[PDB]
Amino acid sequence: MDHLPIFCQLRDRDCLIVGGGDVAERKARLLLEAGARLTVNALTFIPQFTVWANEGMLTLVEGPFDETLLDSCWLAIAATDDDTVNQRVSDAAESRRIFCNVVDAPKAASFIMPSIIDRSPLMVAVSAGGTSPVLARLLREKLESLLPQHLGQVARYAGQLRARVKKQFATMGERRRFWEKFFVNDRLAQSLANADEKAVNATTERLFSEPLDHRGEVVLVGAGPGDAGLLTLKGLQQIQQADIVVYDRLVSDDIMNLVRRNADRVFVGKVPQEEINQILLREAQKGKRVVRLKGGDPFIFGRGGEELETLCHAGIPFSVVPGITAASGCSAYSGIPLTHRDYAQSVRLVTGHLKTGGELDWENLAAEKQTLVFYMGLNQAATIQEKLIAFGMQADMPVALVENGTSVKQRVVHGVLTQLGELAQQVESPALIIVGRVVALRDKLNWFSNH
Amino acid sequence: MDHLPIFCQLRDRDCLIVGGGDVAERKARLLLEAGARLTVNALTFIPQFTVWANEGMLTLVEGPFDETLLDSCWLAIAATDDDTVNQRVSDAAESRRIFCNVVDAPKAASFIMPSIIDRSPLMVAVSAGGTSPVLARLLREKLESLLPQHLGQVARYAGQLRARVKKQFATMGERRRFWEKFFVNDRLAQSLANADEKAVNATTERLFSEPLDHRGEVVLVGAGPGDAGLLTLKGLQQIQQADIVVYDRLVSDDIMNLVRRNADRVFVGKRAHCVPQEEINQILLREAQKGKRVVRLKGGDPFIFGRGGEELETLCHAGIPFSVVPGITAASGCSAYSGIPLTHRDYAQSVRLVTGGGELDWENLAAEKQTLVFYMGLNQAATIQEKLIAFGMQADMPVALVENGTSVKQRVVHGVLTQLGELAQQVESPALIIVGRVVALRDKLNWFSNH
Ligand SMILES: Nc1ncnc2c1ncn2[C@@H]1O[C@H](CSCC[C@H](N)C(=O)O)[C@@H](O)[C@H]1O
Ligand SMILES: Nc1ncnc2c1ncn2[C@@H]1O[C@H](CSCC[C@H](N)C(=O)O)[C@@H](O)[C@H]1O
Numbered sequence: 001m002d003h004l005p006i007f008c009q010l011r012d013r014d015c016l017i018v019g020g021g022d023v024a025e026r027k028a029r030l031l032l033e034a035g036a037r038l039t040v041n042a043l044t045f046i047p048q049f050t051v052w053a054n055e056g057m058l059t060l061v062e063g064p065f066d067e068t069l070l071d072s073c074w075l076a077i078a079a080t081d082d083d084t085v086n087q088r089v090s091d092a093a094e095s096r097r098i099f100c101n102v103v104d105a106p107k108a109a110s111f112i113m114p115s116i117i118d119r120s121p122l123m124v125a126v127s128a129g130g131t132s133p134v135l136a137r138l139l140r141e142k143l144e145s146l147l148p149q150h151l152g153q154v155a156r157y158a159g160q161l162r163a164r165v166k167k168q169f170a171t172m173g174e175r176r177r178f179w180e181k182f183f184v185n186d187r188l189a190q191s192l193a194n195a196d197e198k199a200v201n202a203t204t205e206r207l208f209s210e211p212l213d214h215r216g217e218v219v220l221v222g223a224g225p226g227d228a229g230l231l232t233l234k235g236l237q238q239i240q241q242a243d244i245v246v247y248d249r250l251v252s253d254d255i256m257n258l259v260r261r262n263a264d265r266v267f268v269g270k271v272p273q274e275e276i277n278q279i280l281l282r283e284a285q286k287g288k289r290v291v292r293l294k295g296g297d298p299f300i301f302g303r304g305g306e307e308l309e310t311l312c313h314a315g316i317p318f319s320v321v322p323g324i325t326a327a328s329g330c331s332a333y334s335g336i337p338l339t340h341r342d343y344a345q346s347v348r349l350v351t352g353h354l355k356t357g358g359e360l361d362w363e364n365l366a367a368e369k370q371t372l373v374f375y376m377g378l379n380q381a382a383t384i385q386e387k388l389i390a391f392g393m394q395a396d397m398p399v400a401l402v403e404n405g406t407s408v409k410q411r412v413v414h415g416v417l418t419q420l421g422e423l424a425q426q427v428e429s430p431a432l433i434i435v436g437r438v439v440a441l442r443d444k445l446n447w448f449s450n451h
Numbered sequence: 452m453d454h455l456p457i458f459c460q461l462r463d464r465d466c467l468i469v470g471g472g473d474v475a476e477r478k479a480r481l482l483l484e485a486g487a488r489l490t491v492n493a494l495t496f497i498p499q500f501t502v503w504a505n506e507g508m509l510t511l512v513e514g515p516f517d518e519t520l521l522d523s524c525w526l527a528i529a530a531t532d533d534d535t536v537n538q539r540v541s542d543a544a545e546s547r548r549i550f551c552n553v554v555d556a557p558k559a560a561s562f563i564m565p566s567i568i569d570r571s572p573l574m575v576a577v578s579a580g581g582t583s584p585v586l587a588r589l590l591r592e593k594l595e596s597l598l599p600q601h602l603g604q605v606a607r608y609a610g611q612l613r614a615r616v617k618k619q620f621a622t623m624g625e626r627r628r629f630w631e632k633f634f635v636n637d638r639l640a641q642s643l644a645n646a647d648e649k650a651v652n653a654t655t656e657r658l659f660s661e662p663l664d665h666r667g668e669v670v671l672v673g674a675g676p677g678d679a680g681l682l683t684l685k686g687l688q689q690i691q692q693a694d695i696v697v698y699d700r701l702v703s704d705d706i707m708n709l710v711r712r713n714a715d716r717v718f719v720g721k722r723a724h725c726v727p728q729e730e731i732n733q734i735l736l737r738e739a740q741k742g743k744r745v746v747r748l749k750g751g752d753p754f755i756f757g758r759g760g761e762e763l764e765t766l767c768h769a770g771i772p773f774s775v776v777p778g779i780t781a782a783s784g785c786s787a788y789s790g791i792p793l794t795h796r797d798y799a800q801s802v803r804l805v806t807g808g809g810e811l812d813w814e815n816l817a818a819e820k821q822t823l824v825f826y827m828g829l830n831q832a833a834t835i836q837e838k839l840i841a842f843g844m845q846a847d848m849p850v851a852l853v854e855n856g857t858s859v860k861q862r863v864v865h866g867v868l869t870q871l872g873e874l875a876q877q878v879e880s881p882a883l884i885i886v887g888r889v890v891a892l893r894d895k896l897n898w899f900s901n902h
């Protein structure tokens with residue numbers, strides 16, 4: 001990330017503003033509301049600074065820049081229209097390791113002042129680092145319309161209850177469940193905004209009195225096939241609140257960025273199945289919220305049933321959030337719809353790597369008017385070609401392989417069935433093989449990329 | 452104001468973390484992502500730290516906290532479990548005017564770490580001053596769903612274009628209307644993320660060529676099977692940006708409640724008076740030809756028995772840009788929410804999604820090692836049971852019917868094949884017929900509750 005947002009406690013800490021114009025005044029007003037001990041150093045001052053100075057709210061130093069005024073400071077702001085002066089300020093701040101903002105030069109000097117949405121004590125800060133002030137302001141207004149103006153009172157009351165919550169609830173999980181009920185209780189928010197203290201108390205005492213669940217839980221969450229935008233809203237909620245996230249190699253890097261930063265992550269990629277069940281079983285017995293993040297959809301060639309059998313065998317509660325399976329994602333993003341008019345009566349999702357000497361029912365798979373989608377069939381692509389042809393599929397049946405479907409690394413190769421073996425040499429796992437007349441729709445429906 | 456939010460430039464600046472456990476690992480990952488020149492001081496380090504050190508990512512100093520490690524530091528984080536050590540760290544940072552965070556004691560320090568939504572260079576930070584970390588996480592979750600993953604690339608590109616935008620739009624009112632359709636242009640964001648560097652210039656040059664009023668495009672969005680939580684992040688983002696939403700009765704009202712206020716809605720579903728597909732095709736064409744951002748919302752997944760292919764061919768001839776957001780198909784939703792996985796161990800080599808029109812290959816559907824999922828099949832249900840018994844499927848094959856899958860009114864009826872015709876009258880559209888051995892697992896994996 002380009003910047004690290006922090007929320008600084010400036011109360012009674014010295015800060016310096018150099019410059020005495022309109023820009024300096026708006027930054028000074030901010031620092032004053034944050035309680036800073038403020039010095040302003042400038043050749044001239046607009047009248048607002050004299051009004052602040054006679055109220056004793058800051059110190060004015062009328063004159064050129066004095067570097068020694070930085071000696072006690074925690075923050076420095078260069079707010080003159082003289083870039084030579086602003087750079088002397090920035091240089092002096094740098095040598096002293098004082099974070100310094102140069103208002104007219106965001107890319108220089110060590111901090112940026114963001115746009116602020118204030119629901120005190122709740123605060124939201126927005127900045128595009130100076131690369132796009134219009135987007136920061138567009139975003140700032142949208143956030144203004146979505147944050148209710150009684151949220152400050154809800155947050156203020158939360159702060160007042162924190163000691164009691166810590167005293168009455170022993171486990172972190174029991175305290176988080178209390179807070180999760182607290183922050184979605186609309187009647188409590190309303191009673192706070194109305195200063196209705198009998199109602200605040202009645203709801204609060206009931207909240208403290210509820211039996212808060214003590215169980216751990218396992219949620220199986222389909223990550224989708226790669227693109228982070230293909231996570232479901234419920235899936236995002238689970239990994240934004242998980243204690244632990246058990247993920248594999250087929251969950252994309254972008255989806256792992258949506259995981260709550262405070263969550264522990266355990267990789268189980270290449271690990272057999274007997275092991276994954278074990279991690280899930282024991283992390284859930286610790287009373288922790290566990291998410292098993294699986295590529296695609298958990299119940300389509302994902303051994304999701306096997307993970308849930310063990311937890312049912314152990315009395316551990318669980319749920320399942322379905323995901324965009326690889327077939328749907330690659331279909332959408334390659335421009336190959338899985339059904340279309342009477343091209344396809346049926347869609348077949350097939351595994352290409354099977355148990356022991358188990359054989360696919362090739363005469364069944366070769367039937368017309370269907371779309372075949374082979375999962376993990378890359379290394380058997382030459383056998384699929386041979387078998388489909390031998391069991392009657394026409395030689396010029398279109399085929400496509402979609403490698404890393406829906407991601408920015410997506411590659412699609414396509415051809416006819418007699419090419420399937422050669423085409424598979426040109427991609428690598430993870431890839432889908434799609435066989436069917438719908439493949440020819442690609443050059444009309446492909447919106448995603450030339451790769 | 453209690454805390455002043457600032458966005459710090461940390462690249463190549465010395466920062467110090469004291470502590471070497473899981474808490475310090477989370478803070479260190481954040482400061483590494485910000486490019487800090489990081490030293491970590493701890494009595495011991497969890498292995499993730501020695502990995503970072505071996506990779507040259509940071510510096511490890513093993514031993515008790517040493518004040519002089521602060522001597523050139525810009526930020527300090529106390530991340531140990533020992534209050535006495537955290538206090539020594541915070542006292543030593545205070546006397547050096549180094550902003551310091553005590554992870555376990557947010558008001559004992561000089562800065563708070565807020566929740567971060569990272570779309571660099573665009574950044575959003577949420578904090579309530581330690582009063583409400585759960586509220587901050589809830590807000591961060593909401594914002595994470597609203598802000599597209601590649602927004603940052605759009606932000607950076609806007610910055611390169613500011614020069615050109617000013618000297619081509621006189622009034623600042625126009626310039627903003629330009630930016631407003633700029634930061635929502637789907638193909639611009641996709642073309643930036645895919646490094647398709649001439650599609651970027653192709654859609655950049657057109658953005659100035661089009662009349663400022665013209666935002667004409669069609670997005671096919673899969674609404675998923677009913678539960679509003681099963682919409683994708685990307686689907687929600689597209690719905691929030693639409694001028695017009697064209698939807699049908701199989702789009703749940705929970706999903707329609709997510710489409711924002713002043714968007715036009717066009718209902719093309721059944722009113723009794725069947726609507727043929729061609730008039731639907733014309734409506735999208737018509738609404739997109741007036742320069743409006745059109746979202747075609749469809750139940751489930753657009754490319755699985757949704758005729759979505761048919762709607763995009765109408766647009767391809769007219770030169771109307773389109774894209775597709777896949778959705779959770781009914782088979783995936785009903786499988787997760789009825790505890791019937793579509794695959795499991797070696798119960799099924801293949802999953803077949805089939806419609807119930809055209810003529811069914813009955814010998815083919817009766818073959819073993821399949822999970823059969825019948826879409827739109829309730830009418831032919833009596834025929835389906837008769838034909839599958841007559842073509843060799845065992846009479847004791849488990850069947851299930853899932854009606855209104857994933858909604859608060861979902862009903863699931865299950866028996867064996869020879870009762871399939873009877874069970875079908877007990878449900879109504881929309882319903883799935885699932886035939887296969889996996890159906891027996893619902894007894895163990897059903898976590899939703901039946902209505
Ligand atoms: N992004 C992707 N592009 C192409 N194929 C993918 C893919 N992600 C997963 N797959 C396919 O899925 C196989 C793993 S089997 C697990 C699939 C997952 N449960 C789902 O529903 O999609 C891979 O071998 C590959 O064939
Ligand atoms: N919520 C739901 N529960 C059960 N079946 C559903 C369903 N929603 C859609 N269906 C099935 O889908 C059929 C309409 S065809 C459209 C299906 C959609 N494109 C999808 O991908 O799911 C209905 O006849 C019904 O069989």
